[PDB]
């Protein structure tokens, strides 16, 4: 029949890329890491253009759009329940194939209970047991203390919102549940104080739209850009919407009346957005604005 | 070194220190010293448990199974690792000691009884 | 690469095969036991309790 | 300063930028050039450039240099097989020359990266040992798991020492 | 196939032909120095086996590994003359030369 | 340790170890489990031999292995 | 002495009297440690405190009572940290004793855990090229049918009690070494009361 | 030592000096900025549209010590100790 | 029946692969010919005592 697009559809990742935006001084920021004598090269015109080009394509590898994904089922299977060796042993035995030419979620963990019953290591478990044998750089065995409530609006409060969320993808997996809860967490303190600037330019921009798409509260989100002059990207922020949302208000006032460009958003702050009234005085105002430009 | 005769062994060599114990499983000589030259590594072994309350395994099953198909003999304990594991039936004396536990375990139930009884 | 042979080794190593086979012990000397003390006079040594 | 014209020429970093690794059929490699005529330019700063960058890559390759034997240069490949590889290298510039050579008995870069990933599970993480073999020497190096006794004492129930004594 | 001699193909030069059925070949190869990192020619001496003893003082050969060695140090025999004293034929065209200077036009030939 | 050449020392000139008692129920019991956890284990040692052979013989003389050898052998000529 | 800012490290840094002493510039500007030959020792005096005694030329830590190293102390810390690289300058470097530097880096440590001072935080790659979790290690393996029966996983796991000739064999085959006959063993493993 | 010192620097090129000999623009390239092009330098003047020359190999001298050091085969107990600020 | 493990690991390679069966690996033990531990043994290949005597 109809289904709705995904996160890694190529509808949903152009249009996704046009609002993230390549920022080449954001991107390559000059970083405080050990540092080395700079190189220097004469180049003409043509060549500082190509030049640039390359730091153009470079930079799309750097702003690729992580996978977004559902919560994984925790695991709860059982290979074996041998009584035999019941209370023999007073602490569990964890065993981990360690084949090199193995994908990690591929690998047998299995844990010996001390009752004799043989089972999976579960999801926890596994990414414990995985960066014991086959270390990852920024990847600590026992969770920080950083993504503790307190810490994590510590680093909220010194808008270092991208740095939590690089934190989180070194550490925790993005099926993991702690993964998404930090995520989801750093969505929120975003819309709620209006920091969407903070992700602009970068690779996790498309994972807060997609988020916010889902539960409806793309008004924030909306704000932000008509007072930025992305009405390109405001645009498409609500026909995203309406593609994801085909049964809404919104969406089916759209085919009604035809709307297109500016007027989409006039449609959804009436019919949809919680903030219309809102949404309707800071599109007027930026009409107004535009209107004396033209002139 | 050509010892006269011998075959490959998948053992623990013991490391760490004192009252510390920590065990690497290789694949070695029969007549190699217990910490000496070894042929591949197989994985290690921690008997003791870490702040999870876990002893922590490490069985590199792919060459384990090409080691034992090259003709490498397991020792004991080992042969222990793998039943415990599953990879290997549970061996004999595993089971009998578990048997043998309960039946230790039975007569100081009846002892404990006859105290409390009695008197 | 020459090397300074030992020709007394390869000589002691024929002597004592060629005495191993002139001067082998036989069943009756080897597998003799004394019933009493369940020892084997060749050797001395005392033979398993189980088999006593 | 290094001595010689060009000292680029007697550095690693200038010797491993070779491009050329030779295949196993491959066993000698001998260069006939002339030491002047414009012609033979290209094969001049081959020998020059070029030839120590080729034996730095390919260690086990003989290479013999002859001059002013023949009227023209050209470069001569004798394989395992027993085959005879020649190539002409007149009026051709060293850059042409390195990329021909590589394109004929030059293993591509598909065969390269692979023999580099053999070499890559040769080191298993997980394996415990000195530096020079493993990244970890014990595994109390490991975070969560019993410490070091040299760093951290053990406690007193988990040492021999003490468990004697209160045994006996 | 299978050879126990290490150098299987070598190319060098002819030293000596005062041995019966076989020639004293003379082989350089390129060895780096760890310090300077500039390749000097190393020579090592290769006695070759040479059926017909047509080998010439000074000439350049090809050596091919014999699958044993049929003397104490004769382990090579020879393959194919590369360059004869004084009588090269040039690869590239198939004309005598002398030096720099086709003894035959290539162009007789066409 | 001692070598063969070592006298044997006098305190156990006289030594004799006595062979532990035998359980009869707990004897025959494990005597069958030795019996047949060797069963398992050799034929488990059988198939591990097998594959070991298999992957040798595959990466001599194997489909893949003599495609690739072919391949090479097309694009040197 | 007693320092009033023990509580809160951070209040001294922004006082009248840090002001006057200090300045614009770290603490361990104006130190310069006393040594024999141009080229100094390369590791510091281990404290400069012993037994409650103050050496004759204190580091920049000790000199200065009123300095609580304390990962708070976000303002402290980033004069031992180099702005342009982030990483923590070695002892002979500021002058601090070991025993202080080592307080230090645990400091520094504790506050970059806590995000209270800011430090480089490397973008990396995802750890595994395929998420998909329908392998059988990650799902759920079809039970055996010894497990849904409950049997054991091989009949001789259970104790079976052997027969009576073979039982007599072993005692005549025993004769004088034998120890009492075990029946079998209990179903589940006992406990105290 | 002193004389020496202030002839040097006294005859150093800025970058802005170099850009106006040759021409083109200098670009700064910082390995913690990434393949970012920086522009330090732009000459005031016309800008030439020719490419300079790419040389193969550049017959520049090089300097042993610091090649050695490059290379890692110098060993040496006084250098890279730690000392105090300057 | 195979070692749990074993067992896991075969069925989850049929999986991976694209098989789907039911049927549970098991181990041909028929091959294995278990002897008694005092049947004979080659007395060919049996060594004999060395000539020293006491
Ligand atoms: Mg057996
Ligand atoms: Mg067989
Ligand atoms: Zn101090």
Same mark, same amino acid.
């Given at each position: 029949?109809?289904?709705?697009?995904?996160?890694?559809?190529?509808? !949903?990742?152009?249009?996704?890329?046009?609002?993230?935006?390549?920022?080449?001084?954001?991107?390559?920021?000059?970083?405080?890491?050990?540092?080395?004598?700079?190189?220097?090269?004469?180049?003409?015109?043509?060549?500082?253009?190509?030049?640039?080009?390359?730091? !153009?394509?470079?930079?799309?590898?750097?702003?690729?759009?992580?996978?977004?994904?559902?919560?994984?089922?925790?695991?709860?299977?059982?290979?074996?329940?041998?009584?035999?060796?019941?209370?023999?042993?007073?602490?569990?035995? !964890?065993?981990?194939?360690?084949?090199?030419?193995?994908?990690?979620?591929?690998?047998?963990?299995?844990?010996?209970?001390?009752?004799?019953?043989?089972? =999976?290591?579960? +999801?926890?478990?596994?990414?414990?047991?995985?960066?014991?044998?086959?270390?990852?750089?920024?990847?600590?065995?026992?969770?920080?203390?950083?993504?503790?409530?307190?810490?994590?609006?510590?680093?909220?409060?010194? #808008?270092?919102?991208?740095?939590?969320?690089?934190?989180?993808?070194?550490?925790?997996?993005?099926?993991?549940?702690?993964?998404? =809860?930090?995520?989801?967490?750093?969505?929120?303190?975003?819309?709620?104080?209006?920091?969407?600037?903070?992700?602009?330019?970068?690779?996790?921009?498309?994972?807060?739209? +997609?988020?916010?798409?889902?539960?409806?509260?793309?008004?924030?989100?909306?704000?932000?850009?008509?007072?930025?002059?992305?009405?390109? #990207?405001?645009?498409?922020?609500?026909?995203?919407?309406? !593609?994801?949302?085909?049964?809404?208000?919104?969406?089916?006032?759209?085919? #009604?009346?035809?709307?297109?460009?500016?007027?989409?958003?006039?449609?959804?702050?009436?019919?949809?957005?919680?903030?219309?009234?809102?949404?309707?005085?800071?599109?007027?105002?930026?009409?107004?604005?535009?209107?004396?430009?033209?002139? | 070194?050509?010892?006269?005769?011998?075959?490959?062994?998948?053992?623990?060599?013991?490391?760490?220190?004192?009252?510390?114990?920590?065990?690497?499983?290789?694949?070695?000589?029969?007549?190699?010293?217990?910490?000496?030259?070894?042929?591949?590594?197989?994985?290690?072994?921690?008997?003791?448990?870490?702040?999870?309350?876990?002893?922590?395994?490490?069985?590199?099953?792919?060459?384990?199974?090409?080691?034992?198909?090259?003709?490498?003999?397991?020792?004991?304990?080992?042969?222990?690792?793998?039943?415990?594991?599953?990879?290997?039936?549970?061996?004999?004396?595993?089971?009998?000691?578990?048997?043998?536990?309960?039946?230790?375990?039975?007569?100081?139930?009846?002892?404990?009884?006859?105290?409390?009884?009695?008197? | 690469?020459?090397?300074?042979?030992?020709?007394?080794?390869?000589?002691?190593?024929?002597?004592?095969?060629?005495?191993?086979?002139?001067?082998?012990?036989?069943?009756?000397?080897?597998?003799?036991?004394?019933?009493?003390?369940?020892?084997?006079?060749?050797?001395?040594?005392?033979?398993?309790?189980?088999?006593? | 300063?290094?001595?010689?014209?060009?000292?680029?020429?007697?550095?690693?970093?200038?010797?491993?930028?070779?491009?050329?690794?030779?295949?196993?059929?491959?066993?000698?490699?001998?260069?006939?050039?002339?030491?002047?005529?414009?012609?033979?330019?290209?094969?001049?700063?081959?020998?020059?450039?070029?030839?120590?960058?080729?034996?730095?890559?390919?260690?086990?390759?003989?290479?013999?240099?002859?001059?002013?034997?023949?009227?023209?240069?050209?470069?001569?490949?004798?394989?395992?097989?027993?085959?005879?590889?020649?190539?002409?290298?007149?009026?051709?510039?060293?850059?042409?020359?390195?990329?021909?050579?590589?394109?004929?008995?030059?293993?591509?870069?598909?065969?390269?990266?692979?023999?580099?990933?053999?070499?890559?599970?040769?080191?298993?993480?997980?394996?415990?040992?000195?530096?020079?073999?493993?990244?970890?020497?014990?595994?109390?190096?490991?975070?969560?798991?019993?410490?070091?006794?040299?760093?951290?004492?053990?406690?007193?129930?988990?040492?021999?020492?003490?468990?004697?004594?209160?045994?006996? | 196939?299978?050879?126990?001699?290490?150098?299987?193909?070598?190319?060098?030069?002819?030293?000596?032909?005062?041995?019966?059925?076989?020639?004293?070949?003379?082989?350089?190869?390129?060895?780096? $120095?760890?310090?300077?990192?500039?390749?000097?020619?190393?020579?090592?001496?290769?006695?070759?086996?040479?059926?017909?003893?047509?080998?010439?003082?000074? $000439?350049?050969?090809?050596?091919?590994?014999?699958?044993?060695?049929?003397?104490?140090?004769?382990?090579?025999?020879?393959?194919?003359?590369?360059?004869?004293?004084?009588?090269?034929?040039?690869?590239?065209?198939?004309?005598?030369?002398?030096?720099?200077?086709?003894?035959?036009?290539?162009?007789?030939?066409? | 340790?001692?070598?063969?050449?070592?006298?044997?020392?006098?305190?156990?000139?006289?030594?004799?170890?006595?062979?532990?008692?035998?359980?009869?129920?707990?004897?025959?019991?494990?005597?069958?489990?030795?019996?047949?956890?060797?069963?398992?284990?050799?034929?488990?040692?059988?198939?591990?031999?097998?594959?070991?052979?298999?992957?040798?013989?595959?990466?001599?003389?194997?489909?893949?292995?003599?495609?690739?050898?072919?391949?090479?052998?097309?694009?040197?000529? | 002495?007693?320092? %009033?800012?023990?509580?809160?490290?951070?209040?001294?840094?922004?006082?009248?009297?840090?002001?006057?002493?200090? *300045?614009?510039?770290?603490?361990?500007?104006?130190?310069?440690?006393?040594?024999?030959? *141009?080229?100094?020792?390369?590791?510091?005096?281990?404290?400069?405190?012993?037994?409650?005694?103050?050496? *004759?030329?204190?580091?920049?830590?000790?000199?200065?009572?009123?300095?609580?190293?304390?990962?708070?102390?976000?303002?402290?810390?980033?004069?031992?940290?180099?702005?342009?690289?982030?990483?923590?300058?070695?002892?002979?470097?500021?002058?601090?004793?070991?025993?202080?530097?080592?307080?230090?880096?645990?400091?520094?440590?504790?506050?970059?855990?806590?995000?209270?001072?800011?430090?480089?935080?490397?973008?990396?790659? %995802?750890?595994?090229?395929?998420?998909?979790?329908?392998?059988?290690?990650?799902?759920?393996? %079809?039970?055996?049918?010894?497990?849904?029966?409950?049997?054991?996983?091989?009949?001789?796991?259970?104790?079976?009690?052997?027969?009576?000739?073979?039982?007599?064999?072993?005692?005549?085959?025993?004769?004088?070494?034998?120890?009492?006959?075990? *029946?079998?063993?209990?179903?589940?493993?006992?406990?105290?009361? | 030592?002193?004389?020496?010192?202030?002839?040097?620097?006294?005859?150093?090129?800025?970058?802005?000096?170099?850009?106006?000999?040759?021409?083109?623009?200098?670009?700064?390239?910082?390995?913690?900025?990434?393949?970012?092009?920086?522009?330090?330098?732009?000459?005031?003047?016309?800008?030439?549209?020719?490419?300079?020359?790419?040389?193969?190999?550049?017959?520049?001298?090089?300097?042993?010590?610091?090649?050695?050091?490059?290379?890692?085969?110098?060993?040496?107990?006084?250098?890279?100790?730690?000392?105090?600020?300057? | 029946?195979?070692?749990?493990?074993?067992?896991?690991?075969?069925?989850?390679?049929?999986?991976?692969?694209?098989?789907?069966?039911?049927?549970?690996?098991?181990?041909?033990?028929?091959?294995?010919?278990?002897?008694?531990?005092?049947?004979?043994?080659?007395?060919?290949?049996?060594?004999?005592?060395?000539?020293?005597?006491?």
């Amino acid at each position: 029949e109809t289904k709705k697009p995904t996160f890694m559809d190529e509808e !949903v990742q152009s249009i996704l890329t046009k609002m993230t935006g390549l920022n080449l001084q954001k991107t390559f920021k000059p970083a405080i890491q050990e540092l080395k004598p700079p190189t220097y090269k004469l180049m003409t015109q043509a060549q500082l253009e190509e030049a640039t080009r390359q730091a !153009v394509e470079a930079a799309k590898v750097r702003l690729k759009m992580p996978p977004v994904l559902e919560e994984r089922v925790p695991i709860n299977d059982v290979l074996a329940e041998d009584k035999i060796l019941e209370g023999t042993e007073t602490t569990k035995y !964890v065993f981990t194939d360690i084949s090199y030419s193995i994908p990690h979620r591929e690998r047998f963990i299995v844990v010996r209970e001390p009752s004799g019953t043989l089972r =999976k290591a579960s +999801w926890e478990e596994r990414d414990r047991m995985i960066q014991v044998y086959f270390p990852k750089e920024g990847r600590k065995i026992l969770t920080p203390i950083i993504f503790k409530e307190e810490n994590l609006r510590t680093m909220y409060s010194q #808008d270092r919102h991208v740095d939590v969320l690089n934190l989180c993808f070194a550490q925790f997996e993005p099926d993991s549940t702690e993964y998404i =809860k930090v995520h989801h967490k750093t969505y929120e303190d975003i819309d709620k104080r209006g920091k969407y600037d903070l992700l602009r330019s970068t690779r996790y921009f498309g994972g807060m739209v +997609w988020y916010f798409v889902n539960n409806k509260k793309i008004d924030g989100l909306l704000i932000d850009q008509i007072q930025r002059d992305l009405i390109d #990207d405001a645009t498409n922020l609500v026909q995203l919407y309406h !593609v994801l949302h085909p049964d809404g208000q919104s969406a089916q006032g759209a085919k #009604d009346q035809a709307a297109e460009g500016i007027n989409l958003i006039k449609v959804f702050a009436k019919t949809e957005a919680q903030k219309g009234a809102y949404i309707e005085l800071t599109l007027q105002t930026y009409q107004e604005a535009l209107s004396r430009h033209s002139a | 070194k050509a010892y006269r005769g011998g075959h490959l062994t998948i053992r623990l060599a013991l490391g760490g220190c004192t009252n510390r114990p920590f065990y690497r499983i290789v694949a070695a000589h029969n007549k190699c010293p217990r910490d000496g030259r070894f042929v591949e590594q197989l994985g290690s072994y921690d008997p003791l448990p870490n702040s999870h309350g876990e002893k922590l395994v490490a069985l590199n099953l792919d060459r384990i199974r090409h080691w034992i198909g090259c003709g490498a003999h397991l020792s004991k304990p080992m042969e222990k690792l793998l039943g415990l594991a599953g990879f290997f039936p549970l061996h004999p004396m595993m089971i009998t000691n578990a048997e043998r536990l309960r039946r230790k375990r039975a007569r100081e139930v009846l002892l404990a009884s006859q105290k409390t009884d009695a008197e | 690469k020459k090397v300074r042979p030992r020709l007394i080794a390869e000589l002691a190593r024929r002597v004592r095969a060629l005495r191993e086979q002139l001067n082998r012990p036989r069943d009756s000397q080897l597998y003799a036991v004394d019933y009493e003390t369940l020892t084997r006079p060749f050797s001395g040594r005392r033979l398993p309790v189980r088999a006593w | 300063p290094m001595k010689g014209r060009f000292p680029i020429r007697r550095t690693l970093q200038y010797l491993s930028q070779g491009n050329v690794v030779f295949k196993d059929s491959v066993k000698v490699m001998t260069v006939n050039y002339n030491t002047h005529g414009e012609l033979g330019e290209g094969a001049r700063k081959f020998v020059f450039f070029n030839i120590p960058q080729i034996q730095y890559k390919n260690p086990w390759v003989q290479i013999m240099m002859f001059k002013n034997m023949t009227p023209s240069p050209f470069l001569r490949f004798y394989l395992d097989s027993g085959e005879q590889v020649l190539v002409d290298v007149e009026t051709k510039s060293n850059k042409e020359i390195m990329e021909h050579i590589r394109k004929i008995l030059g293993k591509n870069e598909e065969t390269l990266r692979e023999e580099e990933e053999e070499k890559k599970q040769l080191s298993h993480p997980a394996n415990f040992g000195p530096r020079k073999y493993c990244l970890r020497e014990c595994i109390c190096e490991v975070e969560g798991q019993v410490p070091c006794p040299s760093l951290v004492p053990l406690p007193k129930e988990m040492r021999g020492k003490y468990k004697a004594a209160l045994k006996a | 196939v299978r050879s126990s001699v290490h150098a299987r193909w070598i190319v060098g030069k002819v030293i000596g032909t005062k041995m019966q059925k076989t020639a004293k070949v003379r082989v350089t190869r390129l060895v780096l $120095d760890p310090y300077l990192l500039k390749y000097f020619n190393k020579r090592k001496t290769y006695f070759a086996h040479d059926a017909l003893q047509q080998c010439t003082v000074g $000439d350049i050969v090809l050596l091919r590994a014999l699958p044993v060695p049929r003397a104490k140090h004769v382990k090579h025999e020879l393959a194919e003359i590369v360059f004869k004293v004084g009588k090269v034929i040039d690869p590239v065209t198939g004309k005598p030369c002398a030096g720099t200077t086709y003894l035959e036009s290539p162009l007789s030939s066409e | 340790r001692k070598t063969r050449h070592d006298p044997l020392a006098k305190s156990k000139i006289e030594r004799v170890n006595m062979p532990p008692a035998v359980d009869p129920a707990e004897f025959f019991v494990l005597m069958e489990r030795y019996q047949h956890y060797r069963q398992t284990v050799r034929a488990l040692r059988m198939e591990f031999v097998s594959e070991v052979q298999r992957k040798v013989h595959e990466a001599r003389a194997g489909v893949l292995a003599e495609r690739k050898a072919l391949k090479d052998a097309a694009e040197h000529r | 002495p007693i320092s %009033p800012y023990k509580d809160e490290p951070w209040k001294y840094l922004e006082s009248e009297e840090y002001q006057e002493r200090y *300045g614009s510039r770290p603490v361990w500007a104006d130190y310069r440690r006393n040594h024999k030959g *141009g080229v100094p020792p390369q590791r510091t005096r281990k404290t400069c405190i012993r037994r409650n005694k103050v050496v *004759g030329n204190p580091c920049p830590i000790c000199r200065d009572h009123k300095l609580h190293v304390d990962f708070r102390n976000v303002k402290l810390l980033e004069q031992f940290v180099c702005a342009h690289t982030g990483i923590i300058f070695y002892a002979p470097y500021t002058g601090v004793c070991v025993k202080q530097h080592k307080r230090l880096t645990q400091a520094i440590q504790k506050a970059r855990d806590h995000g209270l001072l800011i430090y480089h935080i490397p973008q990396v790659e %995802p750890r595994d090229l395929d998420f998909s979790t329908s392998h059988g290690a990650v799902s759920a393996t %079809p039970p055996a049918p010894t497990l849904v029966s409950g049997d054991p996983w091989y009949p001789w796991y259970n104790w079976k009690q052997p027969p009576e000739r073979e039982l007599s064999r072993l005692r005549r085959l025993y004769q004088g070494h034998l120890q009492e006959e075990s *029946g079998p063993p209990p179903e589940s493993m006992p406990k105290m009361p | 030592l002193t004389q020496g010192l202030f002839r040097g620097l006294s005859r150093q090129e800025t970058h802005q000096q170099l850009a106006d000999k040759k021409g083109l623009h200098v670009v700064e390239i910082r390995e913690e900025c990434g393949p970012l092009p920086i522009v330090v330098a732009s000459p005031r003047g016309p800008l030439r549209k020719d490419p300079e020359p790419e040389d193969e190999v550049p017959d520049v001298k090089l300097d042993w010590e610091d090649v050695k050091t490059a290379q890692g085969m110098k060993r040496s107990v006084w250098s890279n100790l730690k000392r105090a600020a300057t | 029946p195979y070692p749990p493990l074993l067992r896991a690991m075969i069925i989850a390679e049929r999986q991976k692969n694209g098989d789907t069966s039911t049927e549970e690996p098991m181990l041909n033990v028929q091959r294995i010919r278990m002897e008694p531990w005092d049947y004979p043994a080659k007395q060919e290949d049996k060594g004999r005592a060395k000539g020293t005597p006491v």
